[PDB]
Paper text:
Toxoplasma and Plasmodium are the parasitic agents of toxoplasmosis and malaria, respectively, and use perforin-like proteins (PLPs) to invade host organisms and complete their life cycles. Escape from the PV, and therefore from the infected cell, for subsequent rounds of infection has been shown to be dependent on the perforin-like protein TgPLP1 (T. gondii PLP). We report structures of the membrane attack complex/perforin (MACPF) and Apicomplexan PLP C-terminal β-pleated sheet (APCβ) domains of TgPLP1. The MACPF domain forms hexameric assemblies, with ring and helix geometries, and the APCβ domain has a novel β-prism fold joined to the MACPF domain by a short linker.
An expression construct representing the TgPLP1 APCβ (residues 810 to 1072) was crystallized in space group C2 with the crystals diffracting to 1.1 Å resolution. Comparison of the repeats with one another indicates a root mean square deviation (RMSD) of 1.28 to 1.56 Å over their roughly 80 residues each arranged into six β-strands with four forming one face of a sandwich and two the other. Among the other notable features of the TgPLP1 APCβ is the presence of a long projecting loop at its base, which is tipped by a tryptophan and has additional sequence features that make it resemble the similar loops found at the base of the CTDs of perforin itself and the CDCs. To determine whether the orientation with the long loop down toward the membrane gives the correct interface for membrane binding, we used site-directed mutagenesis combined with liposome sedimentation assays. Complementary to our findings from MD simulations, we found that the wild-type protein had a preference for POPE and also for PIP3-containing membranes, but that binding is reduced by mutation of the extended tip (MLWL→AAAA), by mutation of positively charged residues to neutral ones on the bottom of the domain (K→A, R→A), and by mutation of a histidine in the loop to alanine.
Residue numbers in the entry: 810 to 1072
Write the structure that this text describes.
Amino acid sequence: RNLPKQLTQATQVAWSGPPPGFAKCPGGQVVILGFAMHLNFKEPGTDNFRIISCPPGREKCDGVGTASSETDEGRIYILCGEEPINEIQQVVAESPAHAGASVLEASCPDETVVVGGFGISVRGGSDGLDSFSIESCTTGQTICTKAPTRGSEKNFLWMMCVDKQYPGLRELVNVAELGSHGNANKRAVNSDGNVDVKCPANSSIVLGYVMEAHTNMQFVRDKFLQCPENASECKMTGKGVDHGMLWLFDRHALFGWIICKTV
Ligand SMILES: [Cl-]
Ligand SMILES: [Mg+2]
Ligand SMILES: [Mg+2]
């Protein structure tokens, strides 16, 4: 039909809670696409970072991983509509633990090309967000990659692919952004830095999200929001929370990802 209009019209849902969790579509709707994350930015190692797709045609998306500590959190994002877009196929990939200088690479299934997506690089431990980064996948390619940055130890990505001739695909563009990041600042009441994910000129938002990553994800559940359709940008401030022990500062990173379409 028309991919930008269809994706814009579909309903976005962004859910935070203990993992695995689930996010539900509004009554009468089913998943078109989405992802579920397990994240923990305090515990050591990288096993607590995971992304999976939300399979289409289900009334909800179930998450992944376990609630082993209070710092384990789920973040689930879905786009819901009356029915699936069968031409869409989702792909996730992740690196092994201790990924080193390894670039993560995932390809679309045969005869499909990227609609959009993003990749994240992370490191565990209470200071691991110092190594956080996000990159977008690029519409019209057959591949998406994520390279390590600033001492990261794991890469993961999620993307959506579609049959290469699908109407309107050309009108789409992906933007990911890392906003303010570093030590959290409890002195900044709901103003602890920001992320501002901007559409390129003459485009407006189809869908997307903004999130605050935080050493204690369980204290920033409200800082995970869908991005407003047809706006020129998507903005979020940091909560300003810091539960670091004694002199330690919790870390945070404000980030997001959008797809925009031509107006
Ligand atoms: Cl510190
Ligand atoms: Mg693009
Ligand atoms: Mg930037």
